[PDB]
Design a protein around this ligand. Structure first.
Ligand SMILES: OC[C@H]1O[C@@H](n2cnc3c2N=CNC[C@H]3O)C[C@@H]1O
Ligand SMILES: [Zn+2]
Length: 349
């Protein structure tokens, strides 16, 4: 019995972090590229985490399988189509999937990812492949699916290029720009390449979202807010350590993309302490419950909801409110956003 068997909205989930173990296996075999395990079950266990690690610790999991997906046109599109299917089955009526286009490419990328051998798959090409898959997934399963292109904290040179992709494919799936990666890199939020990209997004009406306060101090959330101009904040658990910033963001209707299970596994959340989302709930903050990387976390959307239900005390009421809030704070145009709110309100009666 799921915790909330009613329509949901997810804004914070990773394409490259939500691939099926079966599909990873398929391509490892088909391409003759190696994997840390030979069966889907053994692969699940080695790519997945059972206990809290660290942000850098969690990031090492992509090395296991990315090499097998990156560079193959049929793989990139396939995981996009299968993603939608996975969400539809979760009750998700609207989702925004994030991914770094450069990390799946094998041509026109200076630091060649995963030691790939030169190919013809351009970062731009991966954006077009993902669009097709998500769009076929929408038609095929009946849920609205949009994408978000991720700037990598350790590679600011890719940033202005991400900005262009968001411009080029504006609303043709791409709805916003993100900043993901290793938040422990002191001052990465402020690298000129990242800064320039967000400043440009503001001048061009491209929506912005930034990971901050996941593992970093509230000072990083302030960089995201003041310099980067985020509309939303990925994670943001640490914002509450700076009361003034918290209540300021609270009073500004800042949307927090919360991922309960994720925060536990990465170490972002000290389990010995009451989760930030409980304060968020009690303060009637504008937030959402997201999965982040179901693959690496061995989870589904019901994992976060149950967690917040059994522990933390979330009610059906708070789930509806929380989802309506995600709908309002989505990066969709007004017309489409209304359509969404109609769906939720219709199916919430
Ligand atoms: O999708 C682009 C990149 O983002 C990383 N990424 C995936 N999940 C997370 C990441 N980034 C930072 N914080 C924790 C968690 O939300 C890996 C991936 O290659
Ligand atoms: Zn994330």
């Amino acid at each position: 019995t799921p915790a909330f068997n009613k329509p949901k909205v997810e804004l914070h989930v990773h394409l490259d972090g939500a691939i099926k173990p079966e599909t990873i296996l398929y391509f490892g075999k088909k391409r003759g590229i190696a994997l840390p395990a030979d069966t889907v079950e053994e692969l699940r266990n080695i790519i997945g985490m059972d206990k809290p690690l660290s942000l850098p610790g969690f990031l090492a999991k992509f090395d296991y399988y990315m090499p097998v997906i990156a560079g193959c046109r049929e793989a990139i599109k396939r995981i996009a189509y299968e993603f939608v299917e996975m969400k539809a089955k979760e009750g998700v009526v609207y989702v925004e999937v994030r991914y770094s286009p450069h990390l799946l490419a094998n041509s026109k990328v200076d630091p060649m990812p995963w030691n790939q051998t030169e190919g013809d798959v351009t970062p731009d090409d991966v954006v077009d492949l993902v669009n097709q898959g998500l769009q076929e997934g929408e038609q095929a399963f009946g849920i609205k699916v949009r994408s978000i292109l991720c700037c990598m904290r350790h590679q600011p040179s890719w940033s202005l290029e991400v900005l262009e992709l968001c411009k080029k494919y504006n609303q043709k799936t791409v709805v916003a720009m993100d900043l993901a990666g290793d938040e422990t890199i002191e001052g990465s939020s402020l690298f000129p390449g990242h800064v320039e990209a967000y400043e440009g997004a503001v001048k061009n009406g491209i929506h912005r979202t930034v990971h901050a306060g996941e593992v970093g101090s509230p000072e990083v959330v302030r960089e995201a807010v003041d310099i980067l101009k985020t509309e939303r904040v990925g994670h943001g658990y640490h914002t509450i350590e700076d009361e003034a910033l918290y209540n300021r963001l609270l009073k500004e209707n800042m949307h927090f993309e919360v991922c309960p299970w994720s925060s536990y596994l990465t170490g972002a959340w000290d389990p010995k302490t009451t989760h930030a989302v409980v304060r968020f709930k009690n303060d009637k903050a504008n937030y959402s419950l997201n999965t982040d990387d179901p693959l690496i976390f061995k989870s589904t959307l019901d994992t976060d909801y149950q967690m917040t239900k059994k522990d933390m005390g979330f009610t059906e009421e708070e789930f509806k409110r929380l989802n309506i809030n995600a709908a309002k704070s989505s990066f969709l145009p007004e017309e489409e956003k209304k359509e969404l709110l109609e769906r939720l309100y219709r199916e919430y009666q």
